[PDB]
Amino acid sequence: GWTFGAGAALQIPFAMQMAYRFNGIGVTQNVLYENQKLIANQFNSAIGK
Amino acid sequence: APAICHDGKAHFPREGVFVSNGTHWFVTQRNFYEPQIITTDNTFVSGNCDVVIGIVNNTVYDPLQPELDS
Numbered sequence: 001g002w003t004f005g006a007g008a009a010l011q012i013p014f015a016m017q018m019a020y021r022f023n024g025i026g027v028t029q030n031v032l033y034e035n036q037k038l039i040a041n042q043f044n045s046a047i048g049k
Numbered sequence: 050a051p052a053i054c055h056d057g058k059a060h061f062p063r064e065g066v067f068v069s070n071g072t073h074w075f076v077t078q079r080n081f082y083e084p085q086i087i088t089t090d091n092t093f094v095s096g097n098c099d100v101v102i103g104i105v106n107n108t109v110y111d112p113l114q115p116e117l118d119s
């Protein structure tokens with residue numbers, strides 16, 4: 001995520017990274033955890049598109 | 050970890066992330082380390098535990114619990 005752009009890089013689990021984006025657009029973070037599988041399937045299919 | 054079970058229901062931190070030093074579990078803001086005691090009024094509930102991945106076991110302390118007997 002943004003830490004390296006800030007400066008010295010910091011590792012973070014990827015799902016945690018996705019959580020804070022949804023925090024950034026106002027949606028509560030529980031949605032990501034409850035529908036991770038659908039989100040992943042859509043992302044891969046979009047790569048196919 | 051992403052979340053902690055208390056009793057059937059799940060809990061999520063209002064801001065920051067959950068951290069552990071091996072001894073116990075705490076919550077902190079992401080830009081400056083300053084651990085805090087996990088309380089009721091730092092998290093909120095949504096859904097059930099079976100949905101989420103990576104959840105762990107602990108107990109949430111209620112500040113009102115030791116004083117409700119008064």
Ligand SMILES: *[C@@H]1O[C@H](CO)[C@@H](O)[C@H](O)[C@H]1NC(C)=O
Binds near residue numbers: 102103
């Ligand atoms: C993290 O990856 C390892 C390797 O597969 C896995 O064993 C572990 O279960 C994963 N973490 C969680 C919380 O499942």
